[PDB]
Amino acid sequence: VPNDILEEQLYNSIVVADYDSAVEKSKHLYEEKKSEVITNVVNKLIRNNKMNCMEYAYQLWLQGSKDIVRDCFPVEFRLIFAENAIKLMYKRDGLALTLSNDVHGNDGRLAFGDGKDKTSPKVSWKFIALWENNKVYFKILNTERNQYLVLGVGTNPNGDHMAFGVNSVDSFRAQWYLQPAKYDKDNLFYIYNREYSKALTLSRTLETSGNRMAWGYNGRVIGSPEHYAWGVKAF
Numbered sequence: 001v002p003n004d005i006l007e008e009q010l011y012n013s014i015v016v017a018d019y020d021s022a023v024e025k026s027k028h029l030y031e032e033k034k035s036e037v038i039t040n041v042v043n044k045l046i047r048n049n050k051m052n053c054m055e056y057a058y059q060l061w062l063q064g065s066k067d068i069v070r071d072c073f074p075v076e077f078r079l080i081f082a083e084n085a086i087k088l089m090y091k092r093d094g095l096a097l098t099l100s101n102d103v104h105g106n107d108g109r110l111a112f113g114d115g116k117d118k119t120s121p122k123v124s125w126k127f128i129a130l131w132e133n134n135k136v137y138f139k140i141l142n143t144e145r146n147q148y149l150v151l152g153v154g155t156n157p158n159g160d161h162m163a164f165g166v167n168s169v170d171s172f173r174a175q176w177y178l179q180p181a182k183y184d185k186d187n188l189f190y191i192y193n194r195e196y197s198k199a200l201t202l203s204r205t206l207e208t209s210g211n212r213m214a215w216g217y218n219g220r221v222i223g224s225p226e227h228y229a230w231g232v233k234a235f
């Protein structure tokens with residue numbers, strides 16, 4: 001079977017969310033030195049912002065094909081599924097996500113993009129995957145505080161939810177799903193909340209410190225990864 005047909009068949013299995021079929025087809029390709037077909041499929045999934053690319057990577061990771069994730073995907077997939085300490089860098093502003101020191105009552109610590117620190121232990125996070133009902137979700141754990149990223153129930157006048165770090169994962173407010181995207185050579189992700197299906201963003205409003213508060217944004221983000229998406233960098 002020609003490579004373009006193998007590409008087609010692999011890509012369709014992922015888009016319909018038959019991950020076991022996608023894993024099986026991938027294993028065959030990778031054994032037969034046709035990593036070009038897998039890489040081409042991943043690149044297409046990302047061009048097309050297909051969320052199912054995350055589940056595909058995760059099932060390869062779980063089903064004994066971590067080598068395929070390492071070798072055929074942007075480095076970010078490795079970083080996510082290996083639970084590497086990473087930095088979450090907002091493409092628009094080049095700021096690292098962090099948590100405040102003081103605890104804002106039952107809300108937890110405030111999440112924000114730090115105006116200055118893009119490098120200390122405060123800006124380290126890890127993604128912790130879980131599978132449910134044919135989807136992969138993530139808890140996003142701050143390394144220093146052992147607190148999880150969450151949206152609060154409250155909203156501003158736009159219907160945006162504030163983001164916080166809290167002690168445990170008690171509800172879908174503390175779980176997230178990812179959608180891949182591209183800007184130039186950089187692979188990015190929209191990061192959506194499971195409870196409210198809003199994208200994690202940084203405020204356009206600057207604090208005098210240069211900090212920007214983090215919010216679950218009530219608005220359109222797709223098509224504008226350079227405004228609303230996140231890079232994942234090795235810490």
Ligand SMILES: [K+]
Pocket residue numbers: 028032
């Ligand atoms: K073959």
